[PDB]
Amino acid sequence: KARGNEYQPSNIKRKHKHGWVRRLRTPTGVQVILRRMHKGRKSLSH
Amino acid sequence: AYEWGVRSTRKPEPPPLDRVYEIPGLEPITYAGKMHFMPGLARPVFPPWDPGWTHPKFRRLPPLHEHPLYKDQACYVFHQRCRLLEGVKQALWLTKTQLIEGLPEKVLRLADDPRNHIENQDERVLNAISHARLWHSTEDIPKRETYCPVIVDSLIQLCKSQILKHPSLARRICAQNNTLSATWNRESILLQVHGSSGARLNAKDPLPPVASQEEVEATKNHVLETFYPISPTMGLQECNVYDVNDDTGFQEGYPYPCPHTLYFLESANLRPRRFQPDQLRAKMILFAFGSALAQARLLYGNDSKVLEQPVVVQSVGTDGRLFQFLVLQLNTTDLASDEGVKNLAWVDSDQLLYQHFWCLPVIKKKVVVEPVGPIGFQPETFRKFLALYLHGA
Amino acid sequence: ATSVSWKSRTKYTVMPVKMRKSGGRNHTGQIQVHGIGGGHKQRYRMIDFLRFRPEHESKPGPFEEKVIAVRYDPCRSADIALVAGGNRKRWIIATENMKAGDTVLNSDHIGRMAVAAREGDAHPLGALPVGTLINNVESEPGRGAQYIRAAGTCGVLLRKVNGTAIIQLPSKRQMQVLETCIATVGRVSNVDHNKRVIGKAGRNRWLGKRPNSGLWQRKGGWAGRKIRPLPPMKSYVKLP
Amino acid sequence: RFLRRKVREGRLRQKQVKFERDLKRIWQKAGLKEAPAGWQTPKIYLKNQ
RNA sequence: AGUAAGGUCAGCUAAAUAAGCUAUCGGGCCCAUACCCCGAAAAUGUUGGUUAUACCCUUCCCGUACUACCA
RNA sequence: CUCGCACACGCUUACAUCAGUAACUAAUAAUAUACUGAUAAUUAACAACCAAUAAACCAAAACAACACUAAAACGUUUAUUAAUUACAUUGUUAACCCAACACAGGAGUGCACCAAGGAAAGAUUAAAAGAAGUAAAAGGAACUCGGCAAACACAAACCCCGCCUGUUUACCAAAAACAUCACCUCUAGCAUUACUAGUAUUAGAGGCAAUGCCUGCCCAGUGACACCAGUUUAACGGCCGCGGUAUUCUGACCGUGCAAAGGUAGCAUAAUCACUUGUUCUCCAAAUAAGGACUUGUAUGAAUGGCCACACGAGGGUUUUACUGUCUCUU
RNA sequence: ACGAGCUACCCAUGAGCAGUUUAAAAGAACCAACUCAUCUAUGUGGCAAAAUAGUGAGAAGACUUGUAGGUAGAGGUGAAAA
Ligand SMILES: [K+]
Ligand SMILES: [K+]
Ligand SMILES: [K+]
Ligand SMILES: [K+]
Ligand SMILES: [K+]
Ligand SMILES: [K+]
Ligand SMILES: [K+]
Ligand SMILES: [K+]
Ligand SMILES: [K+]
Ligand SMILES: [Mg+2]
Ligand SMILES: [Mg+2]
Ligand SMILES: [Mg+2]
Ligand SMILES: [Mg+2]
Ligand SMILES: [Mg+2]
Ligand SMILES: [Mg+2]
Ligand SMILES: [Mg+2]
Ligand SMILES: [Mg+2]
Ligand SMILES: [Mg+2]
Ligand SMILES: [Mg+2]
Ligand SMILES: [Mg+2]
Ligand SMILES: [Mg+2]
Ligand SMILES: [Mg+2]
Ligand SMILES: [Mg+2]
Ligand SMILES: [Mg+2]
Ligand SMILES: [Mg+2]
Ligand SMILES: [Mg+2]
Ligand SMILES: [Mg+2]
Ligand SMILES: [Mg+2]
Ligand SMILES: [Mg+2]
Ligand SMILES: [Mg+2]
Ligand SMILES: [Mg+2]
Ligand SMILES: [Mg+2]
Ligand SMILES: [Mg+2]
Ligand SMILES: [Mg+2]
Ligand SMILES: [Mg+2]
Ligand SMILES: [Mg+2]
Ligand SMILES: [Mg+2]
Ligand SMILES: [Mg+2]
Ligand SMILES: [Mg+2]
Ligand SMILES: [Mg+2]
Ligand SMILES: [Mg+2]
Ligand SMILES: [Mg+2]
Ligand SMILES: [Mg+2]
Ligand SMILES: [Mg+2]
Ligand SMILES: [Mg+2]
Ligand SMILES: [Mg+2]
Ligand SMILES: [Mg+2]
Ligand SMILES: [Mg+2]
Ligand SMILES: [Mg+2]
Ligand SMILES: [Mg+2]
Ligand SMILES: [Mg+2]
Ligand SMILES: [Mg+2]
Ligand SMILES: [Mg+2]
Ligand SMILES: [Mg+2]
Ligand SMILES: [Mg+2]
Ligand SMILES: [Mg+2]
Ligand SMILES: [Mg+2]
Ligand SMILES: [Mg+2]
Ligand SMILES: [Mg+2]
Ligand SMILES: [Mg+2]
Ligand SMILES: [Mg+2]
Ligand SMILES: [Mg+2]
Ligand SMILES: [Mg+2]
Ligand SMILES: [Mg+2]
Ligand SMILES: [Mg+2]
Ligand SMILES: [Mg+2]
Ligand SMILES: [Mg+2]
C-alpha cells in the first residue's frame, strides 16, 4: 500500500537472472553481451 | 503390462549417427582433432575409456559375481532391520521351535521370593522411569532415541547392585556391536542370521538347562504351524554372496564364551520406523537362536545331531514403555528334517511397565487434575526383568 | 524452462513413494487444466493393475494369495488392499467386502464348463458365468486393467460368442473383448463414495480443487437436455 | 394453500416460544438464576428427518 | 411536439370477384324455448383526385402507437 | 519515556585508536556513529564446503496411551566399493538494509519486556485563527443528509438485499458484486511430462446459489445435436387482441381473429419506467421516512430462478432505552 | 530484445498461532502477537509519489510468512474489479 521499495536485494536471485553465465546460455543473451562490448561498457553484466 | 518407467525421466538414447558412417570405405571427418565441438563436422565415436592404472575411488564398481565369495546358490540373510509378516509363526517355522506361553518355572520362582529384591524396589524403579523420561535431558520432551537406551541401562544398574548379596554376578561382562553369523540348512533352503545386536551380556559359566525331559519328549509330537500363501522366506534378504562359516562375536580363548542375555532396543521417533510388537518378538527369536547355534556348533562340532546338553540363551526387547521377554533353549542341530525333536521358547508378550507419562502438568479449567509423573505402574514387569538377570546365579 | 516429471521410480515397491503436485502446469510451465492446485500433501502407492503375474516363469500355473490389510488410498476414490504371496507383496484394488485375513485366487485357465465366481478371485472372461459382475477390465491380453476402477463401479458380462466376450461398461456402453483377458469378479470398495457430502468450501480446497472463475458466460447452443442414441459397440478384436 | 403455510409456521413459532417460557419458569421458580450448564433447549417443533 | 399508423354489414374477419361466420328479420321442426334445418335483407371512416373505380393518393374526423436524449 | 540482545538475508569499512574541523557533511550550535588525514583490525570449536550402488521395511505428526480425515516433512541396518596422509580454503567489524534524505514508512526467526536501550522542551512572551487532550450549570438529539463525532452509555426490536467463514477495484467504491457447500445441464471408453502415474461413484467445459415448499406452458425463429425425418429450453429467447353479455357496477359466460404457446403458482407501489408524496391503518404534538394491508405489476414472475425461514453482516433504512458540548449557547 | 526480487497464481522447502470458553483444532465464540483497512479527524510540495492518531474486521484456517524456482505482451495471471 506504500510502493517505492519494489527492489528487495538478494545475491542468489541477482546472479541467477543477470549473471554472466545466463547471458551466455541463450542466443539472444549473447547479443546483449555483444552490444555492450561494442558500446564500450565497463561492466558487461553482473 | 504397465512398465513403471517413464520416457521423459529415463536417460535418452544416444543421438543417431551421421550419414557419413553409413558409407562403406569412407573415412569420416570429425572434430576430434580440434578437441572441441564444431558445427558441420561429424560426431566422433570413441572407444570406451580404459585407464591404464586403476584408481580406487574413481573406478567403476566391480560386478557382484566378480567377488570371490559369490555363489550360485541363493542364501537368505536376516539382519537387524528385517521385518517378518507372521512374526511369531515364521520365526517358529524357520527355527523349528515350540512356543510356550509364560516364563519358565525357574525364572518365575526366582522373582516371587522376597529374598531377591533390591532395597526400595518400588521407589527406585519409580525414580528410574522419571529419570529416563524427564530428568535425563535438558529439553522438556526428550525424544525416544534418547530415553530408550537410558531406561534399559538404568534398570540394568538396579539389578547390577545385587552383586553384593550374590557375589557371582561379577562373572558377567557386556559387549557392543559384535559381528555374529550362523548358517544352517532348513528344508532344502539355506538361511543365515548375520549382523549385529544392540547390547549383549556374556557369562563365564554356561546357563543350566531349563526344560524338563518330560517336555522335551512331548515336543516330538508337536507339529509346526504352516501358512500356504506366504513362503517362510518372505521378509529376509536374498544374498548371492556369503560365507558358510558360523562366526560368533569373539575369537578363541575368550574368557566369557557363554552368552547370557541379548538386549534389543527399538529407538526411533516415528511410528513406522519402529518394529511392531509381533515383528519385534520375531527379531529376538532368530538372534537368540543364532547365538545359541554358534555355541552348539563351536562346543560340539559341525556335525548335525541332537544335543544331550541343551544351550539356553535369554533376550529382552524394549520399546521404552512396553517390554518383551524371551527365554530360548536349543536342543536340535539337524534342522533339515521336521520330524525330530523341536526346540522350546518361552515368550511373555506385552509386559506393560507403565501406562502413560505426563512430562508437564495437565491443566483443565484452571485446576490441576493429573500432576507430573507416571500414570499407572506394574512392578511385576520389572520383577520379571530382575528374574532374568539373576537366572545364572 | 523444461521441468522433470516426478514419475522416475523404476522398481515396484509396496512402500509409499514421494509425490509432487502439478497444479495444471504442463512441462512448459503454462496453465493447461484450470481449477487444480493447492491441495494437501499426499504419498503415492504403487498399484499393480495386472492381476495375473507369476513370481517366476518356471511355474506359470495359477497361484493363490492372501490379503493382509485394507487401507485408504488418497490418490484414487477406491480402497486398496495389501496382498502378499510367495516372496512379494502387491497393492491391488479391493472389492466391496474384502477384509483382513482373506485368501484370493488368481487364475487364467479357461475351463470348458465353468468356474465358481467368488468376490475376490480373478478369472479370464472365457470361464466366468454369463451373469457376473466384473471390474478392472483388461482391454487386451497382457495389457492390464484400465477400465472400471472407480469406487462402486461394476460392469456386467453380457454374452460369449465365437470365443469372444461382450461386457457392459458403467457408462451403459457395450464393449467387445477377447475372452482370454483377465477380470476381477465383484464391485469396487467404498460403495457410498457417491453419497458423501462435502460440508464446506474448504473441504474442496483440501482435496485440491481451486474455485471456478467468476466470468459470466452466456449459455450457447451446446446447453440443453440432449437425447442421443447409444453409440455402437466398441470392439478391440482385430478381425483378420 | 400458501395462506395456511404462513399460519402453520406462525403457530409453530408460538408453540416453540411458549414451550421455552414453560422451561424458563421451571428453573426460575427453583431458585436458580441461570439455566443449568450444558443445557440448550432443542427446537422440537422444527422440520427434520 | 414530431413521426408512425388504422377505420369495411349490428359485431368480428378475408378479399376488392365486396366473401365467410355470427348477430338481426321471416318460416319450419317441438307441448314451448334453445339447438338444428330453410329463406331473405345488410356495409368499403371521410373530402377531392385516381381513363372509370376499387385495394391507391389527398382532405376532414375519431382513435391507436413510438420517442422526447448529452450536459 | 520505554521495541531490547543475537542470528539469517542485505549493505561493504560507513566500525576502532589519534589528530583536525575557516569551509565541505548533520537541514542549527556544541561537536564527531555519520565530514577530512594518518595508523590499526574480524584469528574456529560455531557456519559454508562436507560418498556411490544393490537389498529388507503397508503401520502419521498433535506430552502420544491411542484415534480422527484432508491420509501426512522427518531413516536405520546388511552387502559390495570409497585416495587414509598433524596443521586445507572461506564468512567473523559497524550506530548498517529497501524507500531521491541520518524519512513518524516497509522488514523473517530465537529469547526477553528487562539487569537492556533512549530524550517529548534551542531561549522567551502566553494575541487571534488552526490542530490534540481534560472538565461543566439547566436541557438530553431540540444538531444534522444520518446519533457523523463525542459520551459516567457499551442494551432491545422490526425490515430490505445476500444464506454463512472467505474474496476484489495496491493509490477516491470492501458492497446488495464474485466465490461457496447444494442441485442441474453438457462433452469424453482412455497410457508413458498437463488432465494422470488416474478410468464414468472418474475428469473436464458452464449455469444457478445451502436447507424447506416449488421450478408452470412453448421447438415457430435462432443455435446445437441428428448432421435424414427429427430431437432439445435447469440452450439463447417467448409466454395475445377486438366486441357483446347477469336492473347499475363487475364480467362466470358467448361471438370472432391471430399464434410455437398466450404470464400458471407465488409475491407485490418492491432496489422494479412514468403516473407517485397511489389509497388506508399503526408509530409522532406534527411522517415525501419506517413497518402491515389493498392492488393489472398492461414494463413482477419461477435455476438470466420465484417464495418462506434459522444463523450471520465494519452493507442499506426505521424505532425504543441509556448517555453525552452534537445542539439551545458557548466558556 | 529485456523484466514475476513489487504484484496475480502455482510448484518445492521451511517457520509461526499465547491465554479464555467447550466431548471439539467446529472454515464455532471472547481477546493479544500477527494480517487486512470500516468510519472520522489531522496531513494535501505532507513524516509518507497513500502516512500518522483514535476507532474497527479476522485471529487453528479458503489462515498469515521467509528462502528459492515456473508462466512474458497477438501474451502471462485472474474466488471478472476489464
Ligand atoms: K479415496
Ligand atoms: K553500508
Ligand atoms: K432529513
Ligand atoms: K469486508
Ligand atoms: K427448433
Ligand atoms: K410497504
Ligand atoms: K459486510
Ligand atoms: K521467476
Ligand atoms: K514516513
Ligand atoms: Mg523504482
Ligand atoms: Mg519479498
Ligand atoms: Mg488426485
Ligand atoms: Mg462449478
Ligand atoms: Mg458465476
Ligand atoms: Mg546506500
Ligand atoms: Mg545534529
Ligand atoms: Mg576528536
Ligand atoms: Mg573517520
Ligand atoms: Mg526529509
Ligand atoms: Mg528534543
Ligand atoms: Mg522550538
Ligand atoms: Mg487559541
Ligand atoms: Mg477544542
Ligand atoms: Mg469530556
Ligand atoms: Mg452540561
Ligand atoms: Mg431532528
Ligand atoms: Mg433542523
Ligand atoms: Mg450517508
Ligand atoms: Mg460513532
Ligand atoms: Mg425499502
Ligand atoms: Mg455475504
Ligand atoms: Mg433472503
Ligand atoms: Mg465477511
Ligand atoms: Mg480502492
Ligand atoms: Mg476503502
Ligand atoms: Mg430437488
Ligand atoms: Mg434457492
Ligand atoms: Mg452470487
Ligand atoms: Mg441472485
Ligand atoms: Mg422454467
Ligand atoms: Mg423443428
Ligand atoms: Mg400480499
Ligand atoms: Mg419482496
Ligand atoms: Mg416505480
Ligand atoms: Mg432515506
Ligand atoms: Mg429522521
Ligand atoms: Mg409493504
Ligand atoms: Mg418482464
Ligand atoms: Mg433462460
Ligand atoms: Mg428478471
Ligand atoms: Mg447456518
Ligand atoms: Mg444490521
Ligand atoms: Mg430517546
Ligand atoms: Mg516471487
Ligand atoms: Mg489458541
Ligand atoms: Mg473463529
Ligand atoms: Mg488487499
Ligand atoms: Mg492507524
Ligand atoms: Mg485514528
Ligand atoms: Mg479521543
Ligand atoms: Mg474480533
Ligand atoms: Mg465473527
Ligand atoms: Mg524471459
Ligand atoms: Mg488476454
Ligand atoms: Mg485472489
Ligand atoms: Mg462487471
Ligand atoms: Mg466496466
mmCIF file of N, CA and C (backbone and C1' of nucleotides) in Angstrom, chain C residues 7 11 24 42-44 71 76 89 146 149 151-152 187 191 194 198 203 212 215-217 225-226 236, chain F residues 55 58 70-72 180-181 186 188-190 194 197-201 206-208 224 232 235 304:
data_model
loop_
_atom_site.group_PDB
_atom_site.id
_atom_site.type_symbol
_atom_site.label_atom_id
_atom_site.label_comp_id
_atom_site.label_asym_id
_atom_site.label_seq_id
_atom_site.Cartn_x
_atom_site.Cartn_y
_atom_site.Cartn_z
ATOM 1 N N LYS C 7 7.576 -38.938 -11.813
ATOM 2 C CA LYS C 7 7.402 -40.372 -12.040
ATOM 3 C C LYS C 7 8.708 -40.959 -12.576
ATOM 4 N N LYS C 11 11.578 -49.524 -10.124
ATOM 5 C CA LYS C 11 11.309 -50.805 -9.490
ATOM 6 C C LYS C 11 10.062 -50.717 -8.618
ATOM 7 N N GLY C 24 -1.868 -28.158 -12.765
ATOM 8 C CA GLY C 24 -2.340 -27.852 -14.095
ATOM 9 C C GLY C 24 -1.286 -27.326 -15.042
ATOM 10 N N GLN C 42 0.347 -35.487 -0.367
ATOM 11 C CA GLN C 42 -0.044 -36.882 -0.490
ATOM 12 C C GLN C 42 1.153 -37.733 -0.887
ATOM 13 N N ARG C 43 1.075 -39.018 -0.549
ATOM 14 C CA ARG C 43 2.038 -40.016 -0.987
ATOM 15 C C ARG C 43 1.342 -41.029 -1.884
ATOM 16 N N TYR C 44 2.083 -41.543 -2.860
ATOM 17 C CA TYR C 44 1.533 -42.434 -3.871
ATOM 18 C C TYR C 44 1.914 -43.877 -3.570
ATOM 19 N N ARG C 71 -6.403 -50.598 3.221
ATOM 20 C CA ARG C 71 -6.042 -49.236 3.587
ATOM 21 C C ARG C 71 -6.815 -48.242 2.727
ATOM 22 N N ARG C 76 -6.730 -42.422 -5.548
ATOM 23 C CA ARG C 76 -7.966 -42.856 -6.177
ATOM 24 C C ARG C 76 -9.122 -42.843 -5.182
ATOM 25 N N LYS C 89 4.908 -58.698 -2.262
ATOM 26 C CA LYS C 89 3.633 -58.103 -1.898
ATOM 27 C C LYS C 89 3.175 -57.167 -3.006
ATOM 28 N N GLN C 146 -7.582 -51.347 -17.198
ATOM 29 C CA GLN C 146 -7.693 -49.920 -17.475
ATOM 30 C C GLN C 146 -9.078 -49.397 -17.125
ATOM 31 N N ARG C 149 -12.529 -48.908 -12.500
ATOM 32 C CA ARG C 149 -11.739 -48.895 -11.278
ATOM 33 C C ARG C 149 -12.214 -47.885 -10.246
ATOM 34 N N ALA C 151 -14.789 -46.042 -7.430
ATOM 35 C CA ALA C 151 -15.469 -46.604 -6.271
ATOM 36 C C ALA C 151 -16.908 -46.966 -6.616
ATOM 37 N N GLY C 152 -17.274 -48.221 -6.367
ATOM 38 C CA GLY C 152 -18.636 -48.671 -6.560
ATOM 39 C C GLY C 152 -19.034 -48.966 -7.986
ATOM 40 N N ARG C 187 -17.726 -55.941 -6.977
ATOM 41 C CA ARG C 187 -17.887 -54.497 -7.063
ATOM 42 C C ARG C 187 -16.780 -53.811 -6.273
ATOM 43 N N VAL C 191 -18.542 -48.187 -1.492
ATOM 44 C CA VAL C 191 -19.739 -48.070 -2.320
ATOM 45 C C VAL C 191 -20.392 -46.704 -2.144
ATOM 46 N N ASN C 194 -20.288 -42.011 -3.593
ATOM 47 C CA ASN C 194 -21.182 -41.078 -4.269
ATOM 48 C C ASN C 194 -22.074 -40.339 -3.281
ATOM 49 N N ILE C 198 -19.940 -32.934 1.001
ATOM 50 C CA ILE C 198 -18.889 -32.002 1.387
ATOM 51 C C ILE C 198 -19.536 -30.845 2.139
ATOM 52 N N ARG C 203 -13.289 -27.889 2.328
ATOM 53 C CA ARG C 203 -13.001 -29.292 2.052
ATOM 54 C C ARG C 203 -12.648 -29.514 0.587
ATOM 55 N N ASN C 212 -13.837 -21.974 -9.255
ATOM 56 C CA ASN C 212 -14.058 -21.634 -10.652
ATOM 57 C C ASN C 212 -13.931 -20.130 -10.872
ATOM 58 N N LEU C 215 -16.030 -15.191 -14.337
ATOM 59 C CA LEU C 215 -16.549 -14.615 -15.569
ATOM 60 C C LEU C 215 -17.910 -15.213 -15.895
ATOM 61 N N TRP C 216 -18.875 -14.351 -16.205
ATOM 62 C CA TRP C 216 -20.234 -14.779 -16.513
ATOM 63 C C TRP C 216 -20.341 -15.003 -18.017
ATOM 64 N N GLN C 217 -20.488 -16.261 -18.420
ATOM 65 C CA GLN C 217 -20.560 -16.634 -19.826
ATOM 66 C C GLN C 217 -21.992 -17.020 -20.165
ATOM 67 N N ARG C 225 -31.023 -30.169 -22.528
ATOM 68 C CA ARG C 225 -31.104 -31.617 -22.365
ATOM 69 C C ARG C 225 -31.051 -32.282 -23.735
ATOM 70 N N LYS C 226 -29.984 -33.031 -23.992
ATOM 71 C CA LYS C 226 -29.770 -33.682 -25.278
ATOM 72 C C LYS C 226 -30.075 -35.170 -25.164
ATOM 73 N N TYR C 236 -12.408 -54.317 -29.557
ATOM 74 C CA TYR C 236 -10.955 -54.358 -29.632
ATOM 75 C C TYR C 236 -10.443 -55.625 -30.302
ATOM 76 P P A F 55 17.402 -53.510 -5.654
ATOM 77 O "O5'" A F 55 17.364 -54.284 -4.262
ATOM 78 C "C5'" A F 55 17.494 -55.697 -4.210
ATOM 79 C "C4'" A F 55 17.641 -56.190 -2.793
ATOM 80 C "C3'" A F 55 16.496 -55.866 -1.846
ATOM 81 O "O3'" A F 55 15.398 -56.751 -1.982
ATOM 82 C "C1'" A F 55 18.544 -55.353 -0.797
ATOM 83 P P C F 58 6.261 -53.904 4.131
ATOM 84 O "O5'" C F 58 5.793 -52.499 3.548
ATOM 85 C "C5'" C F 58 5.440 -51.438 4.419
ATOM 86 C "C4'" C F 58 4.100 -50.848 4.057
ATOM 87 C "C3'" C F 58 3.478 -49.940 5.106
ATOM 88 O "O3'" C F 58 3.978 -48.617 5.033
ATOM 89 C "C1'" C F 58 1.863 -51.492 4.331
ATOM 90 P P A F 70 -12.103 -35.271 5.010
ATOM 91 O "O5'" A F 70 -10.640 -35.391 4.395
ATOM 92 C "C5'" A F 70 -10.392 -35.123 3.019
ATOM 93 C "C4'" A F 70 -8.979 -34.641 2.794
ATOM 94 C "C3'" A F 70 -7.880 -35.624 3.195
ATOM 95 O "O3'" A F 70 -6.765 -35.469 2.320
ATOM 96 C "C1'" A F 70 -7.649 -33.635 4.445
ATOM 97 P P A F 71 -6.208 -36.725 1.489
ATOM 98 O "O5'" A F 71 -5.254 -37.475 2.519
ATOM 99 C "C5'" A F 71 -4.039 -36.878 2.958
ATOM 100 C "C4'" A F 71 -3.230 -37.815 3.823
ATOM 101 C "C3'" A F 71 -2.594 -38.996 3.092
ATOM 102 O "O3'" A F 71 -1.353 -39.324 3.715
ATOM 103 C "C1'" A F 71 -4.074 -39.800 4.747
ATOM 104 P P A F 72 -0.134 -39.900 2.841
ATOM 105 O "O5'" A F 72 1.120 -39.038 3.315
ATOM 106 C "C5'" A F 72 1.302 -37.704 2.865
ATOM 107 C "C4'" A F 72 1.462 -36.753 4.024
ATOM 108 C "C3'" A F 72 2.614 -37.057 4.970
ATOM 109 O "O3'" A F 72 3.854 -36.537 4.519
ATOM 110 C "C1'" A F 72 0.641 -36.734 6.223
ATOM 111 P P U F 180 -17.641 -21.597 -7.045
ATOM 112 O "O5'" U F 180 -18.076 -22.050 -5.583
ATOM 113 C "C5'" U F 180 -17.119 -22.552 -4.665
ATOM 114 C "C4'" U F 180 -17.657 -22.554 -3.257
ATOM 115 C "C3'" U F 180 -18.988 -23.257 -3.058
ATOM 116 O "O3'" U F 180 -18.843 -24.660 -2.928
ATOM 117 C "C1'" U F 180 -19.006 -21.165 -1.943
ATOM 118 P P C F 181 -19.327 -25.641 -4.103
ATOM 119 O "O5'" C F 181 -19.950 -26.881 -3.326
ATOM 120 C "C5'" C F 181 -19.192 -27.585 -2.357
ATOM 121 C "C4'" C F 181 -19.925 -27.679 -1.044
ATOM 122 C "C3'" C F 181 -21.310 -28.300 -1.099
ATOM 123 O "O3'" C F 181 -21.270 -29.717 -1.095
ATOM 124 C "C1'" C F 181 -21.365 -26.317 0.202
ATOM 125 P P C F 186 -27.676 -33.172 -20.765
ATOM 126 O "O5'" C F 186 -26.313 -32.627 -21.379
ATOM 127 C "C5'" C F 186 -26.320 -31.579 -22.335
ATOM 128 C "C4'" C F 186 -24.933 -31.053 -22.588
ATOM 129 C "C3'" C F 186 -23.892 -32.095 -22.954
ATOM 130 O "O3'" C F 186 -23.955 -32.468 -24.318
ATOM 131 C "C1'" C F 186 -23.014 -30.647 -21.306
ATOM 132 P P A F 188 -18.999 -36.380 -27.209
ATOM 133 O "O5'" A F 188 -17.525 -36.811 -26.796
ATOM 134 C "C5'" A F 188 -17.235 -38.152 -26.441
ATOM 135 C "C4'" A F 188 -15.963 -38.242 -25.638
ATOM 136 C "C3'" A F 188 -15.725 -39.564 -24.931
ATOM 137 O "O3'" A F 188 -15.172 -40.542 -25.791
ATOM 138 C "C1'" A F 188 -15.355 -37.789 -23.421
ATOM 139 P P G F 189 -15.974 -41.899 -26.093
ATOM 140 O "O5'" G F 189 -15.300 -42.953 -25.112
ATOM 141 C "C5'" G F 189 -13.900 -42.907 -24.862
ATOM 142 C "C4'" G F 189 -13.344 -44.264 -24.513
ATOM 143 C "C3'" G F 189 -13.761 -45.404 -25.439
ATOM 144 O "O3'" G F 189 -12.675 -46.317 -25.580
ATOM 145 C "C1'" G F 189 -14.421 -45.898 -23.227
ATOM 146 P P C F 190 -11.592 -46.106 -26.746
ATOM 147 O "O5'" C F 190 -10.363 -45.410 -26.010
ATOM 148 C "C5'" C F 190 -9.746 -46.019 -24.881
ATOM 149 C "C4'" C F 190 -8.664 -45.145 -24.297
ATOM 150 C "C3'" C F 190 -7.773 -45.819 -23.256
ATOM 151 O "O3'" C F 190 -6.459 -45.270 -23.340
ATOM 152 C "C1'" C F 190 -8.841 -43.960 -22.283
ATOM 153 P P A F 194 1.908 -35.905 -16.981
ATOM 154 O "O5'" A F 194 1.055 -34.562 -16.924
ATOM 155 C "C5'" A F 194 1.516 -33.439 -16.189
ATOM 156 C "C4'" A F 194 0.646 -32.234 -16.436
ATOM 157 C "C3'" A F 194 -0.828 -32.409 -16.110
ATOM 158 O "O3'" A F 194 -1.111 -32.220 -14.733
ATOM 159 C "C1'" A F 194 -0.607 -31.445 -18.254
ATOM 160 P P A F 197 -0.894 -38.174 -10.762
ATOM 161 O "O5'" A F 197 -1.465 -39.593 -10.321
ATOM 162 C "C5'" A F 197 -0.620 -40.731 -10.260
ATOM 163 C "C4'" A F 197 -0.458 -41.375 -11.613
ATOM 164 C "C3'" A F 197 -0.669 -42.880 -11.666
ATOM 165 O "O3'" A F 197 -2.036 -43.234 -11.756
ATOM 166 C "C1'" A F 197 1.321 -42.324 -12.808
ATOM 167 P P G F 198 -2.548 -44.643 -11.184
ATOM 168 O "O5'" G F 198 -3.843 -44.261 -10.342
ATOM 169 C "C5'" G F 198 -5.138 -44.398 -10.903
ATOM 170 C "C4'" G F 198 -5.798 -43.061 -11.120
ATOM 171 C "C3'" G F 198 -7.157 -43.109 -11.801
ATOM 172 O "O3'" G F 198 -8.214 -43.399 -10.906
ATOM 173 C "C1'" G F 198 -5.813 -41.507 -12.878
ATOM 174 P P U F 199 -9.051 -44.758 -11.070
ATOM 175 O "O5'" U F 199 -9.767 -44.605 -12.485
ATOM 176 C "C5'" U F 199 -10.699 -43.557 -12.723
ATOM 177 C "C4'" U F 199 -11.465 -43.758 -14.009
ATOM 178 C "C3'" U F 199 -12.149 -45.116 -14.166
ATOM 179 O "O3'" U F 199 -13.378 -44.946 -14.869
ATOM 180 C "C1'" U F 199 -10.652 -44.778 -15.955
ATOM 181 P P A F 200 -14.563 -46.014 -14.694
ATOM 182 O "O5'" A F 200 -15.879 -45.122 -14.627
ATOM 183 C "C5'" A F 200 -16.137 -44.289 -13.502
ATOM 184 C "C4'" A F 200 -17.259 -43.317 -13.770
ATOM 185 C "C3'" A F 200 -18.622 -43.950 -14.035
ATOM 186 O "O3'" A F 200 -19.644 -43.092 -13.530
ATOM 187 C "C1'" A F 200 -17.964 -42.682 -15.916
ATOM 188 P P U F 201 -20.747 -43.663 -12.513
ATOM 189 O "O5'" U F 201 -20.267 -43.145 -11.086
ATOM 190 C "C5'" U F 201 -20.194 -41.753 -10.794
ATOM 191 C "C4'" U F 201 -19.573 -41.499 -9.442
ATOM 192 C "C3'" U F 201 -18.107 -41.908 -9.315
ATOM 193 O "O3'" U F 201 -17.434 -41.029 -8.410
ATOM 194 C "C1'" U F 201 -19.410 -43.142 -7.773
ATOM 195 P P G F 206 -15.167 -22.622 -18.864
ATOM 196 O "O5'" G F 206 -16.601 -23.062 -18.333
ATOM 197 C "C5'" G F 206 -17.412 -22.176 -17.580
ATOM 198 C "C4'" G F 206 -18.864 -22.313 -17.963
ATOM 199 C "C3'" G F 206 -19.875 -21.823 -16.939
ATOM 200 O "O3'" G F 206 -20.067 -20.422 -16.986
ATOM 201 C "C1'" G F 206 -20.510 -23.960 -17.704
ATOM 202 P P G F 207 -20.501 -19.619 -15.664
ATOM 203 O "O5'" G F 207 -22.042 -19.975 -15.491
ATOM 204 C "C5'" G F 207 -22.980 -19.653 -16.506
ATOM 205 C "C4'" G F 207 -24.334 -20.247 -16.214
ATOM 206 C "C3'" G F 207 -24.954 -19.860 -14.883
ATOM 207 O "O3'" G F 207 -25.587 -18.595 -14.926
ATOM 208 C "C1'" G F 207 -25.145 -22.196 -15.200
ATOM 209 P P C F 208 -25.363 -17.534 -13.742
ATOM 210 O "O5'" C F 208 -26.292 -18.070 -12.567
ATOM 211 C "C5'" C F 208 -27.692 -18.203 -12.752
ATOM 212 C "C4'" C F 208 -28.287 -19.162 -11.754
ATOM 213 C "C3'" C F 208 -28.027 -18.842 -10.292
ATOM 214 O "O3'" C F 208 -28.916 -17.865 -9.782
ATOM 215 C "C1'" C F 208 -27.596 -21.134 -10.696
ATOM 216 P P A F 224 -24.725 -24.057 -34.739
ATOM 217 O "O5'" A F 224 -24.924 -25.257 -33.711
ATOM 218 C "C5'" A F 224 -24.102 -25.374 -32.558
ATOM 219 C "C4'" A F 224 -24.624 -26.425 -31.610
ATOM 220 C "C3'" A F 224 -24.756 -27.830 -32.176
ATOM 221 O "O3'" A F 224 -23.530 -28.542 -32.169
ATOM 222 C "C1'" A F 224 -26.738 -27.254 -31.031
ATOM 223 P P U F 232 -37.758 -33.762 -27.263
ATOM 224 O "O5'" U F 232 -36.381 -33.241 -26.655
ATOM 225 C "C5'" U F 232 -36.349 -32.105 -25.805
ATOM 226 C "C4'" U F 232 -34.970 -31.498 -25.749
ATOM 227 C "C3'" U F 232 -34.905 -30.042 -25.317
ATOM 228 O "O3'" U F 232 -34.947 -29.885 -23.910
ATOM 229 C "C1'" U F 232 -33.571 -30.360 -27.245
ATOM 230 P P A F 235 -30.116 -25.706 -19.086
ATOM 231 O "O5'" A F 235 -30.398 -24.467 -20.046
ATOM 232 C "C5'" A F 235 -30.812 -24.670 -21.388
ATOM 233 C "C4'" A F 235 -30.011 -23.832 -22.353
ATOM 234 C "C3'" A F 235 -30.567 -22.450 -22.668
ATOM 235 O "O3'" A F 235 -30.237 -21.488 -21.683
ATOM 236 C "C1'" A F 235 -29.949 -23.536 -24.677
ATOM 237 P P U F 304 -30.473 -20.202 -15.565
ATOM 238 O "O5'" U F 304 -31.273 -18.850 -15.824
ATOM 239 C "C5'" U F 304 -31.356 -17.849 -14.821
ATOM 240 C "C4'" U F 304 -30.599 -16.608 -15.221
ATOM 241 C "C3'" U F 304 -30.879 -15.359 -14.401
ATOM 242 O "O3'" U F 304 -30.144 -15.333 -13.188
ATOM 243 C "C1'" U F 304 -30.922 -14.828 -16.709
#
